[PDB]
Amino acid sequence: SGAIYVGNYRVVNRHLATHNDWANLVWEDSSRDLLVSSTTAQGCDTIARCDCQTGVYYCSSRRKHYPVSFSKPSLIFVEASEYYPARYQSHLMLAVGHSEPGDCGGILRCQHGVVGIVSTGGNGLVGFADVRDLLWLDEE
Ligand SMILES: NC(=O)[C@H]1CCC(=O)N(C[C@H]2CCOc3ccccc32)C1
Ligand SMILES: [Zn+2]
């Protein structure tokens, strides 16, 4: 589990969104595994606006933050899980790192801010949904 809290937005994995998230929906995209809802309180996270390919992510199944090298956001085939059939997921970045289903939502960050959240993984992979192109998270 986990979310990004920027401005009056809450960014979560679409497959983990709550009823309250759907009842206060701003934007969702199944192909990216992302959903954004509105919040009453202002958050403290800031979004990275960069092309970094190195950063650090939080892994809840290890209680640890790991430094990783990751690929550029791309269209990658992801195996079937409890939440999606086997399909192509867009804006996904891959790295070598530990991962388990409960880990969706951990933040990946670089020197500029939050880059994305855990969304895919398995066999020593972990995949991150990018949020750096969502410029509207910084305003309104
Ligand atoms: N964005 C998606 O399509 C995800 C939906 C939920 C989901 O469980 N997965 C499987 C991934 C998540 C990361 O970690 C692992 C490690 C082991 C097994 C499976 C997985 C895919
Ligand atoms: Zn950066």
Side-chain angles (χ1 to χ4, degrees):
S1 66
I4 305 165
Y5 293 98
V6 54
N8 287 269
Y9 298 119
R10 165 175 142 96
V11 188
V12 285
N13 292 92
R14 188 184 185 274
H15 73 273
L16 299 178
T18 67
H19 166 75
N20 187 70
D21 287 324
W22 280 107
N24 292 279
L25 183 67
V26 172
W27 169 83
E28 54 84 25
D29 185 321
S30 174
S31 77
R32 294 178 68 152
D33 185 41
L34 284 181
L35 180 147
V36 177
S37 57
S38 61
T39 66
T40 60
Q42 286 182 285
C44 296
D45 295 319
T46 63
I47 309 299
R49 303 294 179 199
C50 71
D51 65 351
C52 289
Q53 287 187 248
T54 64
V56 174
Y57 81 104
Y58 183 64
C59 176
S60 71
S61 67
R62 295 283 181 271
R63 281 197 195 100
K64 275 196 184 53
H65 293 260
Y66 291 104
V68 286
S69 294
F70 54 97
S71 63
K72 294 189 171 196
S74 328
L75 186 66
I76 303 193
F77 194 72
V78 183
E79 291 305 310
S81 67
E82 301 297 320
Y83 298 97
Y84 298 102
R87 73 195 210 290
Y88 283 96
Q89 181 162 323
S90 64
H91 298 264
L92 186 66
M93 298 173 297
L94 298 189
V96 174
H98 180 66
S99 79
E100 305 178 35
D103 299 312
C104 294
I107 280 171
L108 170 71
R109 65 181 77 231
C110 69
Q111 67 183 100
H112 305 111
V114 175
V115 171
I117 50 187
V118 178
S119 171
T120 80
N123 307 292
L125 303 158
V126 58
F128 304 103
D130 183 52
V131 300
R132 295 177 288 186
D133 66 313
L134 304 176
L135 312 186
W136 55 261
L137 287 171
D138 296 348
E139 64 197 9
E140 176 44 61

Tab-separated table of all heavy atoms in Angstrom, residues 39 49 64 115:
chain	number	residue	atom	x	y	z
A	39	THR	N	-8.147	15.704	-1.967
A	39	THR	CA	-7.997	15.637	-0.515
A	39	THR	C	-8.401	16.952	0.130
A	39	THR	O	-8.314	18.014	-0.495
A	39	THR	CB	-6.524	15.341	-0.120
A	39	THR	OG1	-5.675	16.433	-0.497
A	39	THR	CG2	-6.003	14.060	-0.766
A	49	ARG	N	10.567	16.671	-11.846
A	49	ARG	CA	10.348	17.053	-13.234
A	49	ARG	C	11.745	16.962	-13.865
A	49	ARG	O	12.497	17.949	-13.902
A	49	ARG	CB	9.708	18.475	-13.327
A	49	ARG	CG	8.381	18.630	-12.572
A	49	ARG	CD	7.214	17.786	-13.132
A	49	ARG	NE	5.968	17.969	-12.351
A	49	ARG	CZ	4.936	17.125	-12.368
A	49	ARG	NH1	4.945	16.069	-13.168
A	49	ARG	NH2	3.875	17.339	-11.590
A	64	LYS	N	12.652	-1.447	3.964
A	64	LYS	CA	13.902	-0.850	3.522
A	64	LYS	C	13.730	-0.017	2.294
A	64	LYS	O	12.906	-0.331	1.438
A	64	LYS	CB	14.915	-1.975	3.199
A	64	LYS	CG	15.666	-2.463	4.444
A	64	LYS	CD	16.895	-3.272	4.125
A	64	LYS	CE	17.518	-3.789	5.409
A	64	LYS	NZ	16.534	-4.523	6.263
A	115	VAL	N	9.186	10.314	-8.225
A	115	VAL	CA	9.218	9.890	-9.605
A	115	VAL	C	7.999	9.043	-9.939
A	115	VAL	O	7.457	9.128	-11.031
A	115	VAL	CB	10.528	9.078	-9.865
A	115	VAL	CG1	10.539	8.406	-11.252
A	115	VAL	CG2	11.763	9.941	-9.675
